[PDB]
Symmetry: D2
């Protein structure tokens, strides 16, 4: 009767093979999909003018790092970069392919307030998405990313039912559209750290959100075997004076996932959401000392892979090698953390 | 806590006043929002080439009909027409204002298949909708329309849960966005007549769909006082050899509405969905002999107001007067039907 | 396919005829279904020992009041009373029939905390309900009542999603079971007045609860034509120093109903929930000066019909006539209030 | 705000420890909770009169089998048996304790048709359940069982939305009540094999049902760490002429679980639902050659553990030893199957 028509075996096999390649042991994702405006903030941190040439130089600096593919399975790109050439004229996608890094593409169109909420956000982008996915696949992308955002505010009842319902609906539609176009969807429901709530509050909210997200994925006929999750870790709020221990973050994060995520999903690729480079590595490492797990626990890091790379680049060209060196140090740290083998650098029901 | 923030009293009052003006006794809506392609079919029925000049001539023929505002409270426009001038150079909106007809604007971006359904449709258009609503309000629109489509197929389980969920979600988001921009949303969940199902099947499906739609409107903080519903009448499927009597259509249609539609909604403006001009009038008339009702039962007709107008125009200019004459005959028929006073032309639980 | 099987036309007609008889103009319900324990509190207010003989005397005092049927369409009984005889040996149901008052029966089994909520309540009683309904119908009952309870506490997020979901589920199951056994279900989702919240908070919560209740009634195939609603009025919380004006209570109460209740429902029979006898009458009267309405707005009062009757009885037999006199005064007041004709005694979006 | 209050750490630890003991490697559950009537059918198969003495003899035959605890971690009892003594006067629970088998208790009150469905069933029993759980815990029970039933009928749209919603609601309420009383809930949503549908239809329906069940468990604050699932295997319908291969049943069953069941659940204890003793063992064995899994895959078998035991007993006393011998043969077979080590006896997206 009215059940989902069967997905194409050929398409399903491609999605599942690529999702498992992205969630490969000892590897994770480099998130380099900062929009034209978000990257301005980054370039401002080191005093660089946001010219197309500078963005091309920096993304070339990242993707032409020799040996990066030992630790990086995929790279999320902004649309500009997907169709960009390096200063030397090499397509960015060809830099990735030479390292065997799978290109991915951010496909949402950003955030808009839900009417009559206290500044809670819907993620836009479904219009034309299917046609965009087709073009992006032809350009070399094999996975996609769509970011939704929720916030915790006990006094205001955030996240409200409408926020959660909207986030889940947008992610499920986006995920099904991606899979119909041969792109592995990264499902990113980010619960922001804003506030002074405890780690146990983050855990409760994360559980409620993921339960809703995965029910909606099921309702929309999303193939978990060919999808990835990119959630927040479970942590104290950012206004808390003391950060939770790495063991605490690891425990509550794994618990929240095991309570809500069906194990057909091949990989959970965490966002770093403002954490320091070293915390992001140590928190992931601590989770993978608790393994083996029913899914790969790994990373999809932007700031946590690039912070020191930017401060070492400083917009100054000649120290490109130094900047690439520190990117490799962080890629190695997080690849080792995926295995629970990172040596440091720099049950509750 | 996490309830809807209060709507602006000033905005709410405008929406409610305009919704009641649109649902005025003895009046209804002229649906003239045929897209550039849908109008080609119409012009083909009488052998007219779909030039911008011909579309402008025909829409001018409609909106410059003297005295049309006695029976027509509002006119739904396609975007082209909202910003168009008549052949004589008068803005289409000024033609409407001269008759005191409120301009309205279709804001959805059409239909797209839901992945892994049997050709069941999502309605697209939320991206940029809020900004479009602002521009359309400045151009003179005071209400909007968004068409969703469902079909009945018992053997295939249509409409499936995913279809209904998607339709309701899109309509609720669209309605809340419209109201945040001072536009009265017409909520159109059209259940197609395709198939050979009985009128009682149409009634069951219509009830399930409207129950879902109105729950979602509530979830999204939509102000029913400043909204309108544009549903199918409840009828036999179009493949049935005998059409249901007008009394039967009237009974099951009113029953389906009274079982699902809260009476804060000011107006139900039916689509004609393929009915003949005379059936559309007689079916509405029969419902309003059953009055008084908790909401206005009226019309938002395209074909049922224009069919004979087109065949009388034939693309030939000079018989503009004849064509306008027959438009007035149908506008009067349906205005009188709104009052249950149309004289004809041409309990089950 | 998987839609509700059609209700029996014969059963549906009986339910709809009896629901409309209960919601008759100028009449309402006497709620006399105080359990054996709840009545102890009442008898304690005037110093009477809760013997079966005293309960029989008092219920006989109520139901043998000459002319009560001019204002009382139905009487809700506790099970004991349904099978009880007056001190003179006349069955209580025969007293009701002699006045043409329809007997009704409370069928829930009281409240139990939902695990891991802050003392939020499920209503129990579905087990054996269908068989109880059959016996109660044979004993003369023609409608039933099932009380659910919610509370407002913004700091604790009450009513929580689980509370609302449970209330709606229990009411919908109970209502469908009643109708399968030829009993009109009174659907009572009582939002308690406890707290210091504003009337606008009560309105928001009442809207959310009723939207959920009526969606669940639809999901469970409940025939609205053969059902009744018994909601709280919309008021300030009981800890507020100033009580809302009668005009304010009337406005927000009617608005909350018209925003959520489909007009196929024949009647809304308010609970008085702690209001004084005179407030209960004046608040209902004010709503029916705002008529005519899409459904009957009337009363299902316990305390608001009996408070002075008890204090006049005092457990002293001989002043049975005085007590019956004051019951008639309150029955007349509320019957007149149903018509908006009570002369007193003793738009916001 | 309105989230679940924290479960008691002491209660949670007990539930999780007992759930893991029940789901112990190489062991599973003996389902001996046949009601007084269901056992009549069994005794009739071999011509035994359903006297309390015969039931006591047979349950004693089962539970006094020497060495049974090597393969049986728990035994589900009917209430009669929980408070029964063997013919020799030993309490049934003491027989279990002597083998280290954990006693469990069936707590539902059977099935009742949902009004206006085509004979789809609600499970009754929530009324008084919490108090029953307390008494059963004092009598020695440490886990409970509640059976819901769904059927597949594509032409009738079964299982309908109402069936699934009801099943999920009843299971979630029951599970939360059990855990509040220190009993591990076995969650049994049995999809019947009735019909001629393919194994892929069973897989689709099983996925939809389990997705709904686990969302409802989350909504009701059920601790997955202290719960167990008892689902149907995924198989062809019982009217199909050819039974699916053991490899096919194993593949689709594991897939349906991994697509819907969060891995915090410690154990999935399959019902045998009419399968032969040898099929039940071989199908489980085939699943555990596919291990290791994110949860224990094991058995909760009635017929598949007792069929030959009954036919060997024949109601004749003296061959008690023979009957116990064959029970041990089947207990060993299924314990070995839990490990994927049973030697036989007697990717699709
Ligand atoms: O974490 C996800 C990405 O950083 C979001 O990028 P964006 O802010 O440009 O949408
Ligand atoms: O009934 C609604 C309108 O006729 C839909 O117009 P459209 O086909 O151009 O979207
Ligand atoms: O308002 C409803 C009834 O007064 C409830 O009676 P009860 O407390 O005995 O359940
Ligand atoms: O599979 C579960 C049990 O066999 C059900 O026992 P029952 O039929 O007595 O409820």
């Amino acid at each position: 009767s009215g059940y989902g028509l069967p997905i194409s075996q050929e398409v399903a096999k491609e999605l599942a093979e690529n999702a498992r390649k992205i969630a490969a042991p000892g590897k994770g994702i480099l998130a380099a999909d900062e929009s034209t405006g978000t990257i301005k903030k980054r370039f401002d941190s080191i005093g660089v003018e946001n010219t197309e040439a500078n963005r091309a130089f920096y993304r070339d600096l990242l993707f032409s790092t020799k040996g990066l593919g030992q630790y990086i399975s995929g790279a999320i790109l902004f649309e500009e970069t997907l169709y960009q050439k390096s200063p030397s004229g090499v397509p960015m996608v060809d830099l990735l392919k030479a390292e065997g890094i799978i290109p991915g593409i951010k496909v949402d169109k950003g955030l808009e307030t839900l009417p009559l909420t206290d500044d809670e956000k819907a993620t836009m982008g479904l219009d034309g998405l299917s046609e965009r996915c087709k073009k992006y696949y032809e350009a070399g992308a094999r996975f996609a990313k769509w970011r939704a955002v929720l916030s915790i505010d006990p006094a205001k009842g955030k996240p409200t039912n409408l926020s959660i319902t909207e986030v889940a609906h947008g992610l499920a539609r986006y995920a099904a559209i991606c899979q119909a176009n041969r792109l592995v969807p990264i499902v990113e429901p980010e619960i922001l750290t804003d506030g002074s709530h405890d780690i146990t509050v983050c855990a409760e909210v994360t559980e409620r959100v993921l339960a809703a997200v995965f029910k909606a994925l099921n309702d929309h006929h999303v193939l978990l075997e060919g999808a990835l999750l990119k959630p927040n870790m479970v942590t104290h709020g950012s206004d808390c004076p003391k950060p939770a221990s790495h063991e605490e973050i690891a425990f509550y994060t794994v618990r929240s996932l095991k309570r809500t995520v069906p194990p057909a999903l091949p990989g959970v690729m965490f966002l770093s959401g403002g954490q320091s480079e070293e915390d992001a590595s140590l928190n992931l490492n601590e989770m993978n000392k608790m393994g083996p797990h029913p899914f790969q626990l790994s990373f999809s890091y932007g700031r946590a892979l690039q912070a020191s790379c930017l401060k070492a680049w400083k917009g100054v060209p000649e120290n490109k090698a130094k900047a690439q060196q520190v990117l490799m140090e962080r890629a190695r740290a997080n690849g080792e953390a995926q295995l629970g083998k990172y040596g440091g650098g720099a049950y509750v029901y």
